[PDB]
Write a protein that binds this ligand. Structure first.
Ligand SMILES: CCCCC/C=C/C(=O)SCCNC(C)=O
Length: 281
């Protein structure tokens, strides 16, 4: 084009009308908390988490205009580098007070991932801070999480923010009653230049989890469907259940739900599921 890439001019004339169409929000906007809640739900329900293009090791491009093109025009899915900053930029231009902050994810094994490679939004409405995450693979909060003390109930799950070992830590209350971390964050506002390093980290990583694997998920009302390789986690109204996917037929049934409304991604996703299952046998 004639408008240089990365310029404030490029990101300022992005057609947000088409973005709200992409995430299925055909209403009026104001800056109330109720509008924030509906935008967040719309994005979570409309955009699946998918890392398909990086199965290669091919990195994402980071521009707002490039995320916008992939997500809005090609109607691809999202993740923490391609969805969350763009959503934060849209909210900024719609008048919300928004801050992008880095996070570190808690492994199922029971430890932190080595890098602080997640991103989160904090939105300030009427002098309260609200957490937002539109780029997370597994189970997190589907309504904005108040940065305040004590359990917060959502869809039969209990979430909380609490200061643990010096960091605000988002946890989830398990079936027993014990709490498990989802991730911790730092209140350190990020720009593109501050989280760029993440691409190099996974490029130069031995065995990055976002390369050579199948990772996708979809919020549904009251839960989420998460596919990790040959496993499916179905979170529904305070319960999670697990199923081992045995046949490509079965994986394709499930990928059609996860990618409902995104039928153009199913073949690629089914190919990736087979190529990933093979490459661990
Ligand atoms: C350059 C190819 C790979 C893309 C780089 C990573 C992107 C992300 O989405 S980083 C969040 C990853 N999640 C955990 C637990 O590490």
């Amino acid at each position: 084009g004639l408008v240089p890439r990365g310029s404030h001019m490029e990101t300022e004339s992005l057609p947000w009308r088409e973005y709200l169409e992409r995430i299925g929000y055909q209403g009026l906007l104001n800056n109330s908390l109720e509008c924030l809640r509906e935008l967040y739900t719309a994005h979570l329900r409309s955009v699946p988490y998918e890392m398909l293009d990086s199965f290669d090791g091919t990195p994402p491009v980071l521009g707002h205009a490039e995320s916008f093109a992939k997500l809005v025009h090609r109607r691809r899915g999202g993740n923490c580098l391609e969805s969350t900053p763009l959503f934060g930029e849209f909210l900024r231009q719609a008048g919300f007070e928004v801050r992008l902050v880095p996070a570190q994810i808690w492994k199922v094994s029971g430890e932190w991932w080595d890098a602080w490679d997640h991103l989160l939004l904090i939105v300030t409405v009427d002098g309260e801070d609200w957490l937002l995450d539109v780029g997370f693979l597994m189970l997190t909060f589907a309504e904005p999480l108040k940065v305040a003390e004590g359990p917060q109930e959502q869809s039969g799950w209990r979430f909380r923010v609490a200061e643990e070992e010096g960091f605000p830590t988002v946890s989830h209350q398990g079936p027993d009653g014990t709490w498990t971390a989802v991730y911790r964050y730092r209140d350190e506002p990020q720009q593109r230049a501050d989280y760029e390093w993440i691409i190099d980290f996974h490029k130069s990583a031995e065995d990055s989890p976002l390369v050579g694997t199948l990772l996708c998920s979809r919020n549904v009302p009251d839960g989420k469907l998460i596919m990790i390789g040959e496993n499916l986690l179905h979170a529904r109204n305070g319960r999670v259940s697990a199923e081992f996917i045995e046949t490509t037929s079965r994986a394709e049934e499930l990928l059609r739900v996860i990618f409902a409304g995104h039928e153009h991604m199913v073949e690629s996703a089914v190919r990736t599921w087979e190529k990933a299952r093979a490459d661990r046998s």
